Amino acid sequence: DHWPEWPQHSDRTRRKIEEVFQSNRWAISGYWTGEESMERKFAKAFADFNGVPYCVPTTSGSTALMLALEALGIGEGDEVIVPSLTWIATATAVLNVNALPVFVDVEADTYCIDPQLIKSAITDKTKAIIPVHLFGSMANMDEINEIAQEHNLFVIEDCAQSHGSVWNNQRAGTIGDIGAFSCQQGKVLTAGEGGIIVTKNPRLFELIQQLRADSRVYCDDSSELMHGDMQLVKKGDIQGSNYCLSEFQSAILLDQLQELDDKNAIREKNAMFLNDALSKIDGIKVMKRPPQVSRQTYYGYVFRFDPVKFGGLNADQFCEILREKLNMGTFYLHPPYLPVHKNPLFCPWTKNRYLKSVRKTEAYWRGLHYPVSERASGQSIVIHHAILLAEPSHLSLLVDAVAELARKFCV
Amino acid sequence: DHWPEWPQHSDRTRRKIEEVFQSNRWAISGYWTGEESMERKFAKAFADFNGVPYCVPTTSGSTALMLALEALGIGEGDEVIVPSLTWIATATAVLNVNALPVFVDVEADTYCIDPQLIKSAITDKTKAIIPVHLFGSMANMDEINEIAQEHNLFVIEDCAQSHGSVWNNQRAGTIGDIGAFSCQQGKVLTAGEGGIIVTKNPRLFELIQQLRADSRVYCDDSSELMHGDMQLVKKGDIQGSNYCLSEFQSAILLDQLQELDDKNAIREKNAMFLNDALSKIDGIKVMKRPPQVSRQTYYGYVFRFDPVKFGGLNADQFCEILREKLNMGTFYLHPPYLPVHKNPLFCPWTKNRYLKSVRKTEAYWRGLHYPVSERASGQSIVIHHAILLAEPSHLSLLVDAVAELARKFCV
Numbered sequence: 001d002h003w004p005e006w007p008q009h010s011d012r013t014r015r016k017i018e019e020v021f022q023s024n025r026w027a028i029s030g031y032w033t034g035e036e037s038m039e040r041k042f043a044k045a046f047a048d049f050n051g052v053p054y055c056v057p058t059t060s061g062s063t064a065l066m067l068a069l070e071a072l073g074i075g076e077g078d079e080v081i082v083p084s085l086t087w088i089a090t091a092t093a094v095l096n097v098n099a100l101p102v103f104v105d106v107e108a109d110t111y112c113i114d115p116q117l118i119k120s121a122i123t124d125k126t127k128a129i130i131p132v133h134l135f136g137s138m139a140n141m142d143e144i145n146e147i148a149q150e151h152n153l154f155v156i157e158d159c160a161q162s163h164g165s166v167w168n169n170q171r172a173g174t175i176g177d178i179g180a181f182s183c184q185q186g187k188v189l190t191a192g193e194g195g196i197i198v199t200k201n202p203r204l205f206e207l208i209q210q211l212r213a214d215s216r217v218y219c220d221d222s223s224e225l226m227h228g229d230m231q232l233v234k235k236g237d238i239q240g241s242n243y244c245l246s247e248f249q250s251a252i253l254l255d256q257l258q259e260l261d262d263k264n265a266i267r268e269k270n271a272m273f274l275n276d277a278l279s280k281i282d283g284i285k286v287m288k289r290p291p292q293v294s295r296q297t298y299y300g301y302v303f304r305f306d307p308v309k310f311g312g313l314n315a316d317q318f319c320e321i322l323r324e325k326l327n328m329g330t331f332y333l334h335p336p337y338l339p340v341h342k343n344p345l346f347c348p349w350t351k352n353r354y355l356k357s358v359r360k361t362e363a364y365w366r367g368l369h370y371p372v373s374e375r376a377s378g379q380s381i382v383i384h385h386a387i388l389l390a391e392p393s394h395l396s397l398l399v400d401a402v403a404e405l406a407r408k409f410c411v
Numbered sequence: 412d413h414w415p416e417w418p419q420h421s422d423r424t425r426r427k428i429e430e431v432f433q434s435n436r437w438a439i440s441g442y443w444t445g446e447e448s449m450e451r452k453f454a455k456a457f458a459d460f461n462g463v464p465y466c467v468p469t470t471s472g473s474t475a476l477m478l479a480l481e482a483l484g485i486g487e488g489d490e491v492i493v494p495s496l497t498w499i500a501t502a503t504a505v506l507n508v509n510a511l512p513v514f515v516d517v518e519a520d521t522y523c524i525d526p527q528l529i530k531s532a533i534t535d536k537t538k539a540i541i542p543v544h545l546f547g548s549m550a551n552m553d554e555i556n557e558i559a560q561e562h563n564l565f566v567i568e569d570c571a572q573s574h575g576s577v578w579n580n581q582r583a584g585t586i587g588d589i590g591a592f593s594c595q596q597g598k599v600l601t602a603g604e605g606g607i608i609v610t611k612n613p614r615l616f617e618l619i620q621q622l623r624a625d626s627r628v629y630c631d632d633s634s635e636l637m638h639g640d641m642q643l644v645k646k647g648d649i650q651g652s653n654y655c656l657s658e659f660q661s662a663i664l665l666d667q668l669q670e671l672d673d674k675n676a677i678r679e680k681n682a683m684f685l686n687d688a689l690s691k692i693d694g695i696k697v698m699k700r701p702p703q704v705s706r707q708t709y710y711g712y713v714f715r716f717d718p719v720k721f722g723g724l725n726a727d728q729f730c731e732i733l734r735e736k737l738n739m740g741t742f743y744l745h746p747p748y749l750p751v752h753k754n755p756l757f758c759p760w761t762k763n764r765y766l767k768s769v770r771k772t773e774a775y776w777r778g779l780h781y782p783v784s785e786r787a788s789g790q791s792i793v794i795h796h797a798i799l800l801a802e803p804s805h806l807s808l809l810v811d812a813v814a815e816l817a818r819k820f821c822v
């Protein structure tokens with residue numbers, strides 16, 4: 001018996017792959033072979049799951065974010081507000097469309113973009129905001145939508161770490177103008193690599209299709225197609241490139257989606273258990289869950305600690321101790337990563353592909369200051385969601401480990 | 412008995428997929444699970460196949476072209492020469508890096524970029540050329556390399572339609588500074604979606620890795636990795652995004668690569684047979700194969716006809732007749748598509764993501780004039796490579812069909 005690992009599959013996953021082989025259609029750009037593509041089947045299923053009208057699968061979360069921006073007409077001379085604490089893609093997607101990402105610090109108890117700091121970052125160039133529902137929390141969409149409405153700004157939800165979360169009875173991604181998701185191996189819904197884009201607007205739906213299929217859209221009626229006909233047809237309303245997801249991946253996502261809500265329920269149940277237990281340890285502070293959140297998807301379970309009460313340990317050392325005591329990998333228990341502006345992987349100034357005006361210089365980005373997002377990697381622990389799938393008796397070990405470590409520093 | 416179809420797979424393909432499931436590592440960004448990734452295994456195999464030092468798999472042919480340009484430092488203010496007759500990606504990849512694609516017509520008997528027209532298109536802004544080995548021919552690399560050397564220009568080979576072709580004992584893609592390939596469903600080496608980048612330069616190799624893995628590169632030594640360790644590590648010499656190929660696709664490509672050279676040999680053998688037979692029909696002109704080509708990979712078999720000798724038929728009508736007589740789908744027998752500048756899918760002016768200076772206007776592109784590439788779609792027939800895998804007796808039917816049609820217009 002060991003800790004739950006990730007990814008996870010079953011014979012159902014295998015059968016979906018076999019279905020792709022049987023259809024002999026490996027791409028949506030391939031021709032019709034008799035029945036609907038895995039892409040459309042997944043898109044329809046995910047649309048119902050999110051209670052959103054339109055869904056367009058794509059290649060990755062990074063590309064989903066990029067196309068979302070393109071669909072909204074964002075480009076050179078524009079500014080896009082994003083949180084400092086998130087994966088660098090949230091910011092590089094902006095640079096990819098020739099726009100300038102503008103960082104805003106996150107809230108101390110949610111690690112999501114601080115609404116009260118967004119207003120000060122708005123300029124005449126600001127065109128949109130990309131809130132990120134980080135780890136196991138949601139950005140305050142009540143506040144964000146209010147700011148967006150008042151300042152005429154678009155909203156793109158980066159839901160790569162929150163498939164299925166619910167804010168005021170709306171699934172994450174359906175709240176903003178366009179929702180973007182990642183299906184990379186570590187995420188709760190994955191096919192190794194993959195992306196998803198959702199929107200409520202019909203026009204954006206057509207634009208997004210074209211943006212990912214070299215300016216093409218689905219034919220008028222797929223029920224009329226005969227074996228050998230193309231399902232994608234020319235449109236040309238907006239220039240796109242090839243960002244189509246392979247049928248093999250759409251098939252795996254279809255399979256994984258079948259158990260997504262239930263597994264999320266299990267993770268959430270265990271997360272609350274941890275909140276109850278861990279919150280009773282002096283010096284330990286769990287994240288603050290807003291009343292508006294009725295369902296929280298935990299891509300990562302996060303809890304913070306007071307170094308003053310824990311022998312001055314940094315998150316790295318804290319995690320090392322826990323991992324040795326619980327015998328779990330670094331991939332499953334570790335501190336949050338560095339904020340984007342300080343992250344070595346974020347280095348815009350290194351390539352000519354980026355406009356000189358937006359890539360700036362190393363000093364410009366590295367010199368930015370966002371206290372909360374910066375201190376996060378030094379005093380908080382992240383538990384990968386796979387662990388949240390373990391039996392309660394096993395999770396207790398984690399709580400005991402933290403308790404033991406606390407008793408050691410208790411004077 | 413019917414015509415060969417595409418894609419094609421066997422139990423070997425299935426076993427590779429099963430290996431991915433067994434490893435439980437679905438992405439190269441996932442952690443090490445004991446043995447080498449499918450990505451590295453494929454990269455190594457393809458490198459040996461191409462006799463090229465470095466190979467980096469990616470998401471698509473379009474993205475492969477784009478990253479190749481980024482790796483070479485191409486950006487705003489630059490011009491890149493590309494042929495007018497090719498898939499639009501060859502040109503949109505340039506626009507994707509903020510550079511301006513500059514069209515040059517193709518040769519009447521090869522449909523590949525005319526070397527003698529490139530010189531006139533060179534300006535002080537020109538930084539590179541992207542020759543395309545279109546359908547079943549190769550661009551004249553002797554001439555192109557000479558021009559590139561004299562004008563200090565980089566060369567990127569678009570090999571999406573020529574996996575395995577050989578010019579003067581060098582596989583297509585290994586000749587220029589960087590080679591780009593597509594593994595989309597219709598290509599000779601496919602996994603539904605997929606891309607490949609190859610290069611002889613060590614520095615470019617590192618840059619390309621970072622460009623497709625969020626600024627990361629492979630660890631120093633994979634033999635030291637333990638189960639749970641990450642194989643990708645930070646580098647930060649150049650800004651990249653996530654363009655990693657899923658393990659499922661690398662596995663299928665590994666399988667398909669096993670029989671690529673032999674199937675290409677079969678296609679080539681049949682292509683020559685068609686050249687011999689069809690060339691004996693008055694009004695039919697096969698493509699001209701250069702002496703430098705020792706191995707020609709036929710993604711598409713092309714032959715042209717003289718409308719004057721064929722009742723004034725256009726390629727569309729010619730193909731319709733053949734398809735009805737041979738009973739084969741539109742996907743397998745059809746005329747070449749429109750040149751990029753006239754292609755409805757090519758519409759740069761429609762999105763703000765592109766610099767105003769490079770997207771120009773509809774009239775600017777649509778108003779371009781490239782005679783040869785334009786007449787191609789009206790008087791030539793393209794046979795998909797799958798058909799070139801049929802038994803010789805079956806191909807004879809195609810020759811007979813063309814002969815019958817010719818006898819009908821013979822006065």
Ligand SMILES: *Cc1c(COP(=O)(O)O)cnc(C)c1O
Nearest residue numbers: 060061062087089160182184653
């Ligand atoms: C994983 C992730 C991404 C990017 O998705 P990819 O599939 O890796 O391209 C973007 N934003 C967040 C918050 C993510 O967690």
Ligand SMILES: *Cc1c(COP(=O)(O)O)cnc(C)c1O
Nearest residue numbers: 242471472473498500571593595
């Ligand atoms: C197919 C193709 C591409 C693009 O590859 P994708 O995998 O479709 O992105 C580019 N150039 C040529 C010549 C192609 O045939």
